[PDB]
Amino acid sequence: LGQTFTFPDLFPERKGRQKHSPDPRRGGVPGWFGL
Amino acid sequence: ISRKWEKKNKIVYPPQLPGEPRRPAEIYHCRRQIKYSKDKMWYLAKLIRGMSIDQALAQLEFSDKKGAQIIKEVLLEAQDMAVRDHNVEFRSNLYVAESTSGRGQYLKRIRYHGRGRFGIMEKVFCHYFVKLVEGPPPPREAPKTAVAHAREYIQELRNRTITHAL
Ligand SMILES: [Mg+2]
Numbered sequence: 001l002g003q004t005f006t007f008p009d010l011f012p013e014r015k016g017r018q019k020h021s022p023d024p025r026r027g028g029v030p031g032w033f034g035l
Numbered sequence: 036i037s038r039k040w041e042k043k044n045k046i047v048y049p050p051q052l053p054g055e056p057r058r059p060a061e062i063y064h065c066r067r068q069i070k071y072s073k074d075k076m077w078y079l080a081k082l083i084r085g086m087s088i089d090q091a092l093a094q095l096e097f098s099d100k101k102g103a104q105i106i107k108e109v110l111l112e113a114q115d116m117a118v119r120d121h122n123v124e125f126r127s128n129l130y131v132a133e134s135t136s137g138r139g140q141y142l143k144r145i146r147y148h149g150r151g152r153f154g155i156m157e158k159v160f161c162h163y164f165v166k167l168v169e170g171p172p173p174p175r176e177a178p179k180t181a182v183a184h185a186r187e188y189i190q191e192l193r194n195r196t197i198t199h200a201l
Contacts, residue, residue, distance in 0.1 A: 027122065028119070028120075028122050
């Protein structure tokens with residue numbers, strides 16, 4: 001009948017930072033220990 | 036397979052008694068299953084022995100062998116662990132203590148010849164081992180002088196006995 005189809009996009013995309021890095025100046029000292 | 040060398044970093048020592056000699060840092064590192072052959076790798080390993088890490092890096096860098104880029108990365112890794120994971124003041128203070136190649140496991144393939152004959156072709160792999168020690172490089176041994184030889188010889192003439200004689 002002159003109809004045009006197009007395939008529906010079925011996935012619209014609609015849905016519902018820890019830095020513990022060792023201290024450069026500590027020189028490998030296990031920082032948890034305070035003294 | 037056997038993994039040993041890697042575990043040589045897991046030794047923890049008893050603390051230091053007062054005023055003894057400070058035991059210098061030992062760092063071990065290996066690289067397993069390199070695509071290089073064992074015998075070619077041996078020459079590189081032989082070249083850098085006893086050198087300070089900077090000289091070794093210098094030599095390796097300009098060398099042509101495809102093993103050179105490999106041993107280079109391994110020495111850089113070793114150095115980084117030397118300052119980070121162990122404690123080493125002054126990162127150029129390292130020298131190469133022991134450098135060596137072992138053979139890895141090998142692949143086996145067919146090699147066709149002619150008249151329908153085949154040889155058995157072995158794809159080669161090898162491991163590279165290096166032990167670095169913190170301190171200035173040990174002094175290279177000087178060739179024996181005439182004053183040395185004459186001393187050996189006399190010491191030998193003077194070590195004689197009258198044999199079967201008592
Ligand atoms: Mg063979």
